Structure formats: structure tokens, C-alpha cells
Amino acid sequence: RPEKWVKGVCRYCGTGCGVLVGVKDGKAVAIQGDPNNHNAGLLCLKGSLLIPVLNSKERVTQPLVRRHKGGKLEPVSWDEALDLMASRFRSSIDMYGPNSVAWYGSGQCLTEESYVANKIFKGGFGTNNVDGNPRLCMASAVGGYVTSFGKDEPMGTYADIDQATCFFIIGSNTSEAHPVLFRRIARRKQVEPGVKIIVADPRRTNTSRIADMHVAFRPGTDLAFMHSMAWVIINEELDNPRFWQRYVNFMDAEGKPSDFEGYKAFLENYRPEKVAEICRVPVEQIYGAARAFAESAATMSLWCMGINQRVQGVFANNLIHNLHLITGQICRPGATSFSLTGQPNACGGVRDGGALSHLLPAGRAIPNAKHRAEMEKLWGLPEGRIAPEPGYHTVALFEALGRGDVKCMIICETNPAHTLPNLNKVHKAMSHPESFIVCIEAFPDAVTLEYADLVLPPAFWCERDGVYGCGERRYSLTEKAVDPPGQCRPTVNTLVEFARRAGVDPQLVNFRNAEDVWNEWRMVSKGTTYDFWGMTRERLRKESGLIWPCPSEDHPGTSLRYVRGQDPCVPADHPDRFFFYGKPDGRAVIWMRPAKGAAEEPDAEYPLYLTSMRVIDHWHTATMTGKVPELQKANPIAFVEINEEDAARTGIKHGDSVIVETRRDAMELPARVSDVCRPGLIAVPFFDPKKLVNKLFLDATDPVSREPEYKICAARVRKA
């Protein structure tokens, strides 16, 4: 049937599988995996069933206004809408200044979209109030990498999976969250059965079903566990002194310079027999974890939300790196510290392009006077135009919306009224009578649209062109396969017309399409350690993604960052084979972080840990996966997971209707009793819009990354 195959990227997870979308007569009819991308032709079922979502008629295809708060959404023209948008933002600014205005974006936006909004607000309007949902996700992985290595992003690649002989998979349901990457790990263990897999997770998930050891520790005690692993490694003389002596520095519990002995002495508080009681695991689990890690030829750590969605999130990341730094399981094939990114483009679009409140493009920081000036030069701005202090991070943002400090917001390609924590607070805030909320949303069933005053019809996925950078440093292009339905426009063009109508200088948004913003972004990255100037449209069009740094058109891309002769940011004549160039002395850092717990720990009143999690069939709020009937049959509705032992003595049977209750709300859900949750933990999924679980969660944040702790709060269960 297809007359034509069009190269692109899977719309869903940060595995970043390349696709070929097959079209006939301007209509998509088939999809398959791109044989030349890292995924080597393969897709998971969500991926293979993207054509029904592309072809869905349940779309926002014309602009919409709500004339009054609580009113009905009515058709409006593009010009009226665009004029309503420009004048509201413009004059909010005229009245209250730049900071009364905000951008809430997404790691699902095209890099070019995020790049342009980041420039309108930070260079156009003079506010740093630009954030987005990677704050809710990767913020802790950004703090971990920066503090340990001085730069963001992994130093290795997905190819490293094919060469690890040990996998330490922690706070990660890879099976369900990163399905085609879970298959590469499983394929590795199968080509080489001597490969060891440690899954460190309070829940017993399908990821543990390929594991040699499933460590089901008490929620919040993984920092103690990983300090204990370090103790075992140094105790049994399994460290790499040649490496940590030449390439590592040590910072004690009070954050002061230290040394190996200082490290040894701090770790003495983390003896296996002590920590086993704390973690609630058998003591031999620490020794065997530690041993598999240090003793193996090449060890890869992989982690996701169980580590990051924590108030001790950045410290938890530093602890995985402490493990690689102490053993030298880094900077060589198969051995690496590898944070899993969840979204298709948290990495390229918003992390790398600094579309967060405290950051500037391509490794730059807003408090750094020199960076500001060097962005002002590159964007052709007045001096002092970029504000010196960071805008609102996401929790602070929506607190300000409620206070009325932020009066205008664009919410783009995210669903904050379903996915922000402590939703009774958030809903309150989003219903401020004097807020003007603009939503750019493809799907009319997004629960956020209920708060929207203006709704814009956006071109969806491969209805336009753009770049996604996935978790591997690979930036891949999606070309346009089909026309947008109705009056849907690409968000890049929408953002330029808005900017212009709002008096933004025409030089600032001098883009006719995404290719032009790409060429400008290529320049903003040139000479930095993200340098991807060689990644021209022409070769993104032909290659199946390039991996950065990629500094010239004859550069292949970079696999091993910080390795001499591999990474172009390491000078060929550098005295040393590694160079952790994000730190002033080229050494990476071990941090001796105090192990603590959740912001809301269980107690007599609320004796249970409660967690939230991914299920395989659904993507977040289900506005997309919910349109594929195949993906409903297994998981149509929300449920609560309960431990067998816990349920056996609370008198709860399987499929009993139970009430889950925290300090913030109470919710009725069908119970699902099994060994999946360790004794003392319950778990809810967050896809069902009729069961808004983030009503139950606290929104306490990590004080460095400002990532919320969606992963732990205290709860109790009673039969309904």
C-alpha cells in the first residue's frame, strides 16, 4: 500500500526508536522501525500502532476561546486568537512586567519549538519563567551529572548495552518504560549467559524476570544500600586506585574537600549488616550486588524515576556515580553510568537547549554573567536583557499562578492538570479568575483544556518536521509525512506570529520553518561541549540520527565523552587518557551524601508507602494510547497494587474495592493483590483521567533539582 516511506522518530519514549511512516495518497497507512537507527528496525507495540493515532479524528483542529471562566469553548479564527494571545501577553507585561508571564513546555516538543519559545520569553519578554515537564522527570539526573562530572547527559551510549557484563538496573521498570531497550539488555544476557543483572526496585516487575538478583528494598533506602555497596567494594579491595587517584576528587558529608580515607571513614556508617536491617533486604544482597558490580569486566548502571522522583534525587544520582568512579567502570566500552530519560525529547529540546527557568542554551547558566552576555551577543540582544535570576521552576510556577504573580501562561504539549503532584492545590491554582491560560493541545480529552481560555490547534507529530534528541545524545530528525487536518499549524510558525504580534523584535524570530531555527541553534552550540554544528539538515535527512559532540560535517559523532581521541572536546595532546572537562581540574567527584528518606514518611496514622508508576500499554494521560483499542483491553482503568502479606492480614481480597487515603485526598480503586509490591508499599498508575491519583501525592521537591517526589508519600488502605 505505501507509495513512500518517510523517516522519523517514535513519538513516545526516550528510547528514541527511528521509524519509517508509510504513506499513500497523503494518508499514513503503515509504520515500521527504521533499520538504520539504533533500534535496528524494531518497535514496541505502542510504536507499531502509531498510525491509528496519527489518523484519529479526535483532534483539536481549530482555535477555541472560553469567553468567561467556567464557560464553553467556542470556535474563533486564527487571527482573532493570535491577536487575543499577543495583546494579553504584551499588556500583562506592560502592566506587571515580564515576570507575570510564563512558558510551560514539554520534552515532547520539537527541539526547534522549545528553542523558539525559550528565545521569545528570555530574549523577547525578559523573563526566565520558561520551564516544562522534564523538571518533573530528569531534573535530578541533570543535578547528579553536573555535580559529579560538571556536564549534563550520559558519557556513554546505548551501544554500551551490548558490552556490559553486569547491569545494575535501579529505580527503573525497563520492561514497561523502555521496552525496546529492555529487549537489547535481554538480548545481551542471551548472547552471553554469564552477564549478571541486578534489578533494584521495591516492586517485583517484569524487568526482574531477567534478573539474577532482585533487591526489593524499603522505599527511600537505596542511598544507604548504595553506600553499603561502596563499603563492600573498598572493604574487599575491589576498587580502582589507579583511576580514582588520578581522575577523582572526594567531598565529605559537609561538602568539603576530602580524600579516600575520609571516604572510607564516612562509609563505615554503612556496614552491610546495619544497612540490611534499614533496607529490609537479606545482607548477602548487598555483598552480591556490590561484588557483581566491581568484579565484572564492564558494569552499566541504568536508572529512571525511582531514583529521580525523590527529594534525595540528585544525591541518589551522585551515589550511582560514586560506584562507577570508585571502580573505574566508566569511559570504556560496556562500562558506564547511564541515566534513562523518559521523554522523547527532554534531552535535546529542553535540557540541552536550556528551556528551563535556571538555564541558557548549550550548557549555559542564567546566574553566570559571562554566559548571559554570550547569549545576548548570539541572539543580538540589548545588554542586561536576559534577567540575572532564574525564573519559576514548575512547582513554584503554578504556585505563582495561584497567587496571581503569573497572570498569563502558555501550556504546550503537556497536561499539568493530570500530572502535576498535589492536584487539589494545582487545580485551585489553575482556576485563578484573572489567569489567562493558553493551551496548545492536539487532543480534546486532555483534562487541562478544562482550565484553558485559549486553545490552539497544533500540527501533530510527523504532520511537520523537527528534531528529537533521545537519552543517548542522539539527535534524530523526523520529516513531514502528511498534512495537518483542519486548521492545525506547526507550533514553530505559531510561536513566530505570536512573538511578532506581541511586539517582539522581528530579528529575534527570523524563522520561516524549523530548518531555520535549527541552523540558528547549530550556531549557539558551536564551540561548546554540546557542539553539534556538523549536524546539518542535509545529513539528518540522510542519517538515522547523529550523536553529539559532532563539530564538523566530516565528524562521525561522539560515543565516549571525556575519552581522549574519542571525544573532540578532549584535546588530542591532553596529558591524560580521560578528561572530565566540566570540572576545573579535569577530575570527577565522589560525594559523601547523607542517606535519609522521603519528605513524607509513613507513621501510625498513615503506615504505608505509596508509589506511582508506568504500565506498558499507556502513555501518561492516555490522550494518545487511549485512541488505540488494542492498548485498552489489558488496562482500561486505574487500580491499586497491594502486597499479599499486607492484604492477608488487613482482610483484603484480590479485586476488592478499596479506599486509598493520604493527607491530601481519598480515592476508591480496585485492589490487585500480589508479590509485586514489597510488604508495606502500595502502587497506583496515573493514566486514568477519572482517577486522578496526583490528588493523593505530596509535591515536596528535591532542593537542588526541584523535582517532585512522586515516588514516595505515606498512605493507608481500607475496604470500601
Ligand SMILES: Nc1nc2c(c(=O)[nH]1)N[C@H]1C(S)=C(S)[C@@H](COP(=O)(O)OP(=O)(O)OC[C@H]3O[C@@H](n4cnc5c(=O)[nH]c(N)nc54)[C@H](O)[C@@H]3O)O[C@H]1N2
Ligand atoms: N509505557 C510507558 N512507557 C513510558 C512512559 C509511559 O507513560 N508509558 N513514560 C516515559 C517517561 S516520561 C518516563 S519518566 C519513564 C519512566 O520509567 P520508569 O522510571 O522506569 O517508570 P516508573 O514505573 O515510574 O518507574 C519507577 C520505578 O521506581 C520504583 N520505586 C518506587 N520507590 C522507589 C525507591 O524509593 N527507590 C527506587 N530505586 N525505586 C523506587 C517503582 O517501584 C517503579 O518500578 O518512562 C517512559 N516510558
Ligand SMILES: Nc1nc2c(c(=O)[nH]1)N[C@H]1C(S)=C(S)[C@@H](COP(=O)(O)OP(=O)(O)OC[C@H]3O[C@@H](n4cnc5c(=O)[nH]c(N)nc54)[C@H](O)[C@@H]3O)O[C@H]1N2
Ligand atoms: N504521580 C505521578 N505523576 C507523574 C509522573 C509519575 O511517575 N507519577 N511522571 C511525571 C513525568 S516523569 C512526566 S514526563 C510527566 C508527563 O506528563 P504530561 O507531559 O503532562 O503527560 P502527556 O500525556 O505526555 O502530555 C502530553 C500532552 O500533549 C498533547 N499533545 C500530543 N501531541 C501534541 C502536539 O503535536 N502538539 C501539542 N501542542 N500537544 C500535543 C497530548 O495529547 C497530551 O495531553 O508526568 C509526571 N507526572
Ligand code: SF4
Ligand atoms: S521503545 Fe519507546 S521509542 Fe521505541 S517503539 Fe516503543 S515507545 Fe517508541
Ligand SMILES: O=N[O-]
Ligand atoms: O503509564 N502511566 O501510568
Ligand SMILES: [Mo]
Ligand atoms: Mo518523564
